[PDB]
Amino acid sequence: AFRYTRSQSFDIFDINQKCFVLESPTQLVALHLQGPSSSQKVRLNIALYRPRAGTGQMPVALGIKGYKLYMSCVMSGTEPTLQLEEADVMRDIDSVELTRFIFYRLDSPTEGTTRFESAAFPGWFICTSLQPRQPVGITNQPDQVNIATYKLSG
Template identity: 80%
Template sequence: MAFVPDLDTLESSSLNEETFYGLDCPCLQKKPRLSSDLQPSGQSPAEVGVQVTLAEGHPTKTFRQAAILVVAVTKLLKRPSHHDFSDSDLGSFLDAVFEPVAFQRFDSSYAGAPVYRYIRSQSFDIHDIDHKCFTLESPTQLVALHLQGPSANRKVKLNIALYRPKSSKGSAGAMQTPVALGIKGYKLYMSCVMNGAKPTLQLEEADISRDIDSFELTRFIFYRLDSLAEHTTRFESAAFPGWFICTSPQPRQPVGITNQPGEVNITTYYLSSR
């Protein structure tokens, strides 16, 4: 067990000598000063500075050095000085005893999960501007095609769940309406997921008529973009901004999603609540 001397014993030693602790000796050892270290003649005691010598050799800082620091600072505070003791004076001692600590600064931001508050659901008939309706084919595939006469009963209605962002101020979707697009009569909802190198539209069995508060469920959210002048609607994926639900100009093709609205595929629809 290491021997810790009493602080009064340390303070009783002279400023003209340095106190060290031997590795195997529990008693105090005094190292006499050289003649060049003695106080010059005529110098007043108030002008004597404090000298702290750190032993070379061991790379790590030791308790011995910390004890010398405490004694040196205590004596310095008790003696008169020509200037006030400042932080820089103490810092010079601390720099000699403690290892420097390196800090790294990381600039990062954390985006919280989007939160959408469920309001209500409403059913709509839907067809694109080419008058193609949506039908459900096995197993769970939406297809757009022209329906006439008795075959018109095959068309599906959308059960649109309406949401409202809990915090819409300054958000990207402040002027957009978040919705989930379900198939009426089924627990199937459209979702946009990554498949390979690009997003894909699919139908999933789910029950999301509730608040959406996780990134995982954002795949079911689409922004309904209404054109009041033309009475048309587009649906943009919330999980993949810039990707819109689309139908092919050719009949009997699956309903999909595209990031090139208005070029080849059709991304504009009519909704009717009749």
């Protein structure tokens, strides 16, 4: 279904200039990182895939750079949930199960912004809260009382 092509490291901020930090090994939070603290900003190692749902094709996996984690979308209880999993780099994504790691990177090239739509959960997008220091999650209402728009730089 998808084969790995290459990775590239990016800084990422949401549209309100919050960055990601790894609050605990299983949870990202978004905050305005500043002042006087030891919290380390997360960079993404974005693995680009080639193919072998409403979805704009640039399928990617999102590695949490330096922490040996990849983002995934999975059912928890009865609700789609963003999680972070210890996973090695995957050459092949060739099952419904492994599709949990794939997002479509949706760039708005003119504006230089990006959204990330789950491949396992089409219609669900990676989002942050309007409030700082809350978990990064997924939503089927992107940018509606949350932020689902990012600016990447590499």
